[PDB]
Every structure is written in structure tokens, then in C-alpha cells.
């Protein structure tokens, strides 16, 4: 779990920043190879990182950004796999000629990763296009496990109490109203992610306040079909946005719907 500071080199390339601190590009020397890595650099911040680290350690799947380990130096450091092409929302913004089949491919990969997380009884709680990272144009991984929670053995939801930065436009009604987060809450977020992807990285609920989204959703209103989005994918989107948790699909069924449609488009 713990890494060697002598084997780690930090570059000048800042990849991103948040409240926690920054993420920087780095290099970690292995047995024979040197591995390009992304490094999260930071009492409250340290305990969150150690929690994030323990969450990430349990997780092993091709469609998630894996943790290499942790390092304590000038600051606490979380060393993770590098996804060079960056966040999906920004990529699609800068690459408008990306094909419909390609978007389906990428969102299907996210659903496989989320299917695994669901199976593992972890809730992501920050599932958005900005947090899905591209290794290649045809290979996406889920990242940013800062708000993620391992579910208790006897519970299918996590109940929050005190809170700060919450991405409301991605949050299900049960999250906003009851502070309750399940894998079905991530499915709602997945629907918004799908909308983002087929909108080529446009922000959801443009120009709207959190409260204005809530009123919209209580009217039974949902975001419309993005231009060029296939009807089968918009229908899956809306099903993800089922108000009632009990009737909202799980990720297994979502992944299956995406898997089936992708192969149908592959045969064209």
C-alpha cells in the first residue's frame, strides 16, 4: 500500500485541481519499467484521502482508475493510473466529429465499471462526464472516488449527514430529499452522464439553479433528446431518471441494454 518516494518523480504538468489540492503527472519506477502516473497531492484532507485510498485498494476492474499506492512526503500523495486523453466532457467538446457508435462504446464501458462497483457494494456519489477519463478514444475509466462509500453489509444505501460540495444536477431525488445514496442513485447520475456524452460535453440543465432543477423534476420534466442521439439511448437515459428508486433499473440491466444496442450498431 505504501510507496517509495525515491521511486517517484513529479513533473511540472499539473493535470487538475480541487479543494483537496492538486493532481500532477508523475513517474513511478517498477521492477523493469517506469510507469506514468497521476498523483493527487494534498486533518480533514488527510482522513478523506486515506478513506479514498482504502476504497480504491479494494477495487480491481478495467474500467476504473486504479490506485498504485500512497506516499507521505512534503504532503500526502495518492498515486493512481494515468488516463492521458483526459476528461470525457472536455474531449467531446474538442472533438465534435466523434461518432455515435464511439460514444455508445464509451458509455457502455462506464456502465461495466459501475456494474462492478454495484456488485462490490460501493457507491460512487460523483458520477459525471468530468470524472470519466479517457486512456484512448476507445477506452474510458471512472475516476474521482473522493465522495465514494463502501456500503454496510446490512444496508443498500449510505445516509449522509453534514455536507459540503454536492453536484446537485447529477443527484437523484432520494439524495436531495433524504440524503440517501444507493447504486440506483448512481444510475440516475449515469443517465445525466449519458446526456452529457451525447450532447458532446455540454453541461446539463444549462443556466438553471439547483432549486429550479428540483421543481422541473417534480413536474415530471426531464432533459430532452440531444441532437443525433439514438432513440434507444434516450429511452435508456429516461429510464435511468425514474423518480422512484424501487422502479429505477440497476446497473446490471443498464449494462445489458447498452451492450445489446452497441452490438446492433456494430452490425451496420
From Swiss-Prot:
<feature type="modified residue" description="Phosphothreonine">
    <location>
        <position position="22"/>
    </location>
</feature>
<comment type="similarity">
    <text>Belongs to the protein kinase superfamily. Tyr protein kinase family. SYK/ZAP-70 subfamily.</text>
</comment>
<feature type="modified residue" description="Phosphothreonine">
    <location>
        <position position="162"/>
    </location>
</feature>
<protein>
    <recommendedName>
        <fullName>Tyrosine-protein kinase SYK</fullName>
    </recommendedName>
</protein>
<feature type="modified residue" description="Phosphotyrosine">
    <location>
        <position position="263"/>
    </location>
</feature>
<comment type="subunit">
    <text>(Microbial infection) Interacts with Epstein-Barr virus LMP2A.</text>
</comment>
<feature type="modified residue" description="Phosphoserine">
    <location>
        <position position="211"/>
    </location>
</feature>
<feature type="modified residue" description="Phosphotyrosine">
    <location>
        <position position="158"/>
    </location>
</feature>
<feature type="modified residue" description="Phosphotyrosine">
    <location>
        <position position="178"/>
    </location>
</feature>
<feature type="modified residue" description="Phosphoserine">
    <location>
        <position position="17"/>
    </location>
</feature>
<feature type="modified residue" description="Phosphotyrosine">
    <location>
        <position position="116"/>
    </location>
</feature>
<feature type="modified residue" description="Phosphotyrosine">
    <location>
        <position position="261"/>
    </location>
</feature>
<feature type="modified residue" description="Phosphotyrosine">
    <location>
        <position position="262"/>
    </location>
</feature>
<feature type="modified residue" description="Phosphotyrosine">
    <location>
        <position position="139"/>
    </location>
</feature>
<feature type="modified residue" description="Phosphothreonine">
    <location>
        <position position="214"/>
    </location>
</feature>
<feature type="active site" description="Proton acceptor">
    <location>
        <position position="126"/>
    </location>
</feature>
<feature type="modified residue" description="Phosphotyrosine; by autocatalysis">
    <location>
        <position position="157"/>
    </location>
</feature>
<feature type="domain" description="Protein kinase">
    <location>
        <begin position="9"/>
        <end position="263"/>
    </location>
</feature>
<feature type="binding site">
    <location>
        <position position="40"/>
    </location>
    <ligand>
        <name>ATP</name>
    </ligand>
</feature>
<feature type="modified residue" description="Phosphotyrosine">
    <location>
        <position position="2"/>
    </location>
</feature>
<comment type="function">
    <text>Non-receptor tyrosine kinase which mediates signal transduction downstream of a variety of transmembrane receptors including classical immunoreceptors like the B-cell receptor (BCR). Regulates several biological processes including innate and adaptive immunity, cell adhesion, osteoclast maturation, platelet activation and vascular development. Assembles into signaling complexes with activated receptors at the plasma membrane via interaction between its SH2 domains and the receptor tyrosine-phosphorylated ITAM domains.</text>
</comment>
<feature type="binding site">
    <location>
        <begin position="15"/>
        <end position="23"/>
    </location>
    <ligand>
        <name>ATP</name>
    </ligand>
</feature>
<comment type="subunit">
    <text>Interacts with LYN; phosphorylates SYK. Interacts with RHOH (phosphorylated); regulates mast cells activation. Interacts with NFAM1 (phosphorylated); probably involved in BCR signaling. Interacts with VAV1 (via SH2 domain); phosphorylates VAV1 upon BCR activation. Interacts with GAB2 (phosphorylated); probably involved in IgE Fc receptor signaling. Interacts (via its SH2 domains) with CD79A (via its phosphorylated ITAM domain); the interaction stimulates SYK autophosphorylation and activation. Interacts with FCRL3.</text>
</comment>
Amino acid at each position: 500500500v505504501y510507496l517509495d518516494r525515491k521511486l517517484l518523480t513529479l513533473e511540472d504538468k499539473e493535470l487538475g485541481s480541487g479543494n483537496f489540492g492538486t493532481v500532477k503527472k508523475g513517474y513511478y519506477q517498477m521492477k523493469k519499467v517506469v510507469k506514468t502516473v497521476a498523483v493527487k497531492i494534498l486533518p480533514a484532507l488527510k482522513d478523506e484521502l486515506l478513506a479514498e485510498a482504502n476504497v480504491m485498494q479494494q477495487l480491481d476492474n478495467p474500467y476504473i482508475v486504479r490506485m498504485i499506492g500512497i506516499c507521505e512526503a512534503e504532503s500526502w500523495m495518492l498515486v493512481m493510473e494515468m488516463a492521458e486523453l483526459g476528461p470525457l466532457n472536455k474531449y467531446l467538446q474538442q472533438n465534435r466529429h466523434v461518432k455515435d457508435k464511439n460514444i455508445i462504446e464509451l458509455v457502455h464501458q462506464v456502465s461495466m465499471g459501475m456494474k462492478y462497483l454495484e456488485e462490490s457494494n460501493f457507491v460512487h456519489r460523483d458520477l459525471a462526464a468530468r470524472n470519466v477519463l479517457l486512456v484512448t478514444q476507445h477506452y474510458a475509466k471512472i475516476s474521482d472516488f473522493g465522495l465514494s462509500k463502501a456500503l454496510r453489509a446490512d444496508e443498500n444505501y449510505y445516509k449522509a449527514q453534514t455536507h459540503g460540495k454536492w453536484p446537485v444536477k447529477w443527484y437523484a431525488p432520494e439524495c436531495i430529499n433524504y440524503y440517501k445514496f444507493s447504486s440506483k442513485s448512481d444510475v440516475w447520475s449515469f443517465g445525466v452522464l449519458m446526456w452529457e456524452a451525447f450532447s458532446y460535453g455540454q453541461k446539463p440543465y444549462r443556466g438553471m439553479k439547483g432549486s429550479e432543477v428540483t421543481a422541473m423534476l417534480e413536474k415530471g420534466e426531464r432533459m430532452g433528446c440531444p441532437a443525433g442521439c439514438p432513440r434507444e439511448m434516450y429511452d435508456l437515459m429516461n429510464l435511468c431518471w425514474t423518480y422512484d428508486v424501487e422502479n429505477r433499473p440497476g446497473f446490471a440491466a443498464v449494462e445489458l441494454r447498452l451492450r445489446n444496442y452497441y452490438y446492433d450498431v456494430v452490425n451496420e
